[PDB]
């Protein structure tokens, strides 16, 4: 019924779009921090009484969806994270909590990786992660993976960096690659330090294949200068998909929970009162965990991402932009060569 | 950002009631206290009292309790301070400070607004400018006004480098005070120096320039 | 001489004054640094507590802040998530809840007491002094449940195929299908790991197939001795005691210590910067954040009000000591001690489920 | 209740000296012990919780706030206030002056305005601004009589960047009297004066 949109500024501001009647709230702001952002939905929710946020992000920080899920279990609110670090996926969303990220999570992340190399014929590859959190998961998808396919791969052990900022201790580990295809697993400021260290040892060079998940690139407009030429990434941060197309998926999910939830129940969940100064029967949890719109599956899992997110893989021209080279979001298949 | 601006000064006759207000900007309210510290003139600091304002729960001092009140709104953040049967030893200027913590330090202070309990008339400034007859020094006076404060600016507060406002003296209720500004002599007469005299109680503005 | 500012998060006024006397002394101790202490005691609501975080302590730029428990436990996510925003370490005093030890959600988090799952330490140490080779694992289906499954199959994975995992549905009332299955599995020593709420459940329905007396060996931990599971647990059980776990000022000064011995060795380096001030307009991360808070992990303090002082590769507490209590005739008794690296015997002697009697061990 | 009493009402330092300002507790307090600066027609500041040049020591019942190097801007009162028990007191405040070199004042006489005057009105008014010391001797001569009488004098207070003081004396006439009467003189006694320093005017 009514329904908030924040963004970040570029082309944006034209405000809107069954049963319900939709009152779309658009609002931009520059500040994404802490007390921004619950100063922002808190204000929002005291004047207007918003039953769901549609919020968009132009930065790096990840942390952005940490407040965003903390603020979502918070005031009742279901919360859409639809770009940038709204949508990086991390951490799992909290079970009591309506926060979901048009993301993808790790293990989908690494299966269209494979893919590349299966077409590519790259079965000999190094991994090479840090300490940083949800590497472990990586490396268990991928040698399970590979050790229960039959494309018969070779993979070095794996190497680990324990500390960035090691000085020696970086070389010296990057010295124990052996292969031409690598697989990196860091942040995005990890990965500053280490490409960077790892172009002056010569390994950076169109001699290599360095293939990073999104969290490496993070948003395809912000480019370190120490990102090598020739980089493969697979991120969801496609540039096709359009900022309105993204909050009209937003909007399109939480309007299908509300006409459901009017469905099964003879009421909507009215906004809560106040964030400041002193719960609800039910929510639209079961409602927009499964929706389509536009013959398109919006559903999400019960950790927070979507269930078929949109990959595609990019990589680093020697422009310094990146290029969409491949998509795997048709048919469960990674289509390249474009 | 983090700002307290309270009501204007006031002049209420013996026995009246008077309610003074102090806006909270720039920070959480109900993350504080609201401490209310009165001042006679030139008389030390002297503590009222506080509000919890999560619990709107106040906690007055021995010698302010009966007579004073406090109150707030959470709303427009707003924290009251309501004075009954008014007395001539209330006469002072009452700060509101924001409480640490709760209970903690006072680490932000308003303004302070000035109560002026007294049964005589309000009467209106009646402004003189002096001018003579290097460096050029003019004058203003301000005469027979009634009650503080009166608040005096030069050339619309441009002229602030050389301002000296003096304290206002009394005699038989009625205030006067003189101010002083020294110019170059490259601005004046060649330029213009107006002296500005404003009276929140008479709701009164004069503009009297300087003039050989 | 620059100021640092550390901040806290406390439970009372008097804990405030508590930590200010802490970075006191660690001032007088002597690059000179002058430790400054900023505090405030917990909000009402979290989002107000998140907001306390940013206008207080964050505002006045903080290099890390100790987080305590409210006054009557998963209060300090709010201070994790906030902090955490910039990657301003987060040093928790008082929880043991084990969701802090996933770094994908806390990963600016640490602890001056160690989570309820690293209790199997224990449970592997003195599996190892009795020479027991096959226990029951009893867990609730919950994160605390998990975590202690698998601190405990780590430990054993290090020589599966030594303990048999059995797991309930938290709340459940109804246990009997569930022990039932132990019996059959022919347990003799059970290793139960659940709430008060849930241990009680577990307790009452093992009196009902008559697994509280002889024949049995109970090891659980310090929740499922306390306040109603005590009051349903069988004689002879053996339960552990976190010590100093919950002294609020031994970990006040204990954490002030590490911090401030990890401050002066943070400075000894170079292109260090300062914490943001404040939240607002402040988007990228502390730029020297994620190197404080390995320096802080790194960090060995021997000499500490709770022992040695060494953090997990998580961030969680390392070498705590732990009572061994053994419940005697509706009464814990201490039984021995386990001092971060062994067991200490202590001259009683354990009353096992029933009427066999004997010591902590170390002998045939 | 408690009573906060301050060691010092008053100092005058040089700048760049360290001044220690005392502040002692009938009781024993701890550490809620905090100081506030209130400059001239403003609002108190908090200074210290328990500036980069203010620093605090003591605990229990004897305080003490210490300025390393003393600046002109410190120029105002400093009070103390207990925040350990109800009620809260502040302590007696500790006025601070700070040193100077000797300056002259610079002394300028208005006649009555003519508004004033065609108006039921005669006031003179004198200016002594921007000297130091603050100890000044002003006198009004009328055709070389001194008068003390219907005269006004006020005061402000040291200034936090010249670190001068100003006075301003106003002699207050009936319009009958002044027009009895021709010159009208202000006279000044001052330590950088080696003769008294004069300004008049006639009414002619
Ligand atoms: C904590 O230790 C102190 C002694 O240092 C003692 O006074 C206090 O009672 C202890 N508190 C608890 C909960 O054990
Ligand atoms: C623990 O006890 C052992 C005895 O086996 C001893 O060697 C060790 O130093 C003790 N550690 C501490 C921290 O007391």
Known sequence: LNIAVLLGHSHDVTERELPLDVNVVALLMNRTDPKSLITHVCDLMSGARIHGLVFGDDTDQEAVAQMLDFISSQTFIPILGIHGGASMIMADKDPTSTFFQFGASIQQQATVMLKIMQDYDWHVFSLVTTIFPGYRDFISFIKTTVDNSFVGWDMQNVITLDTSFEDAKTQVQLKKIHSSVILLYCSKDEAVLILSEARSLGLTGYDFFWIVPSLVSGNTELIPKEFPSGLISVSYDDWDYSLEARVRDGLGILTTAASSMLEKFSYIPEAKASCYGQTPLHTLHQFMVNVTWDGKDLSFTEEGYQVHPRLVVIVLNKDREWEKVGKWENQTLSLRHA | ?212 | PKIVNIGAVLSTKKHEQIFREAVNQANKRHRKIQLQATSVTHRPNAIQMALSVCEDLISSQVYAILVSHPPAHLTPTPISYTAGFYRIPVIGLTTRMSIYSDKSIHLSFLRTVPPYSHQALVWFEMMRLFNWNHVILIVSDDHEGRAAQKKLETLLEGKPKADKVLQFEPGTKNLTALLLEAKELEARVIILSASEDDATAVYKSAAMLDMTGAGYVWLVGEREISGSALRYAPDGIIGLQLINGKNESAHISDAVAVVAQAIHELFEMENITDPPRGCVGNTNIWKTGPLFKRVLMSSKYPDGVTGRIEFNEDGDRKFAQYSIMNLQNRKLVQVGIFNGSYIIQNDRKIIWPGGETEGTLVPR | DIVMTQAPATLSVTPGDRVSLSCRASQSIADYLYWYQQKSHESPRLLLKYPSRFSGSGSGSDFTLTINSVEPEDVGMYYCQNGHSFPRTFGGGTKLEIKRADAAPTVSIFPPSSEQLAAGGASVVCFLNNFYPKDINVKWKIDGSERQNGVLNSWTDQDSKDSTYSMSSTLTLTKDEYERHNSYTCEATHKTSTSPIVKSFNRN
């Not at chain 2, 202070?109 to 003019?138: D, E, F, N, R």
């Not at chain 2, 490259?186 to 008479?202: F, G, I, Q």
């Open chain 2, 1 to 212: 950002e983090v700002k307290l601006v309270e009501s204007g000064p006031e002049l209420k006759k013996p026995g009246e009631t008077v309610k003074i207000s102090c806006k909270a900007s720039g920070f959480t309210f109900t993350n504080y206290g609201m401490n209310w510290v009165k001042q006679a003139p030139g008389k030390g600091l002297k503590w009222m009292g506080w509000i919890n304002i999560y619990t709107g729960e106040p906690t007055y001092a021995d010698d302010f309790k009966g007579r004073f009140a406090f109150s707030l709104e959470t709303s427009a953040s707003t924290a009251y301070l309501q004075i009954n049967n008014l007395k001539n030893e209330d006469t002072a200027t009452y700060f509101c400070a924001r409480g640490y913590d709760y209970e903690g330090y006072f680490d932000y202070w308003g303004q302070g607004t000035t109560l002026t309990v007294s049964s005589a008339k309000t009467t209106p400034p009646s402004v003189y400018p002096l001018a003579p007859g290097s460096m050029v020094t003019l004058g203003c006076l301000v005469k027979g006004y009634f009650p503080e404060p009166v608040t005096v600016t030069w050339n619309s507060g441009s002229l602030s480098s050389g301002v000296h406002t003096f304290p206002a003296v009394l005699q038989s209720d009625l205030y006067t005070l003189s101010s002083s500004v020294t110019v170059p002599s490259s601005t004046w007469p060649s330029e213009t120096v107006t002296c500005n005299v404003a009276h929140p109680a008479s709701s009164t503005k004069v503009d009297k320039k300087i003039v050989p």
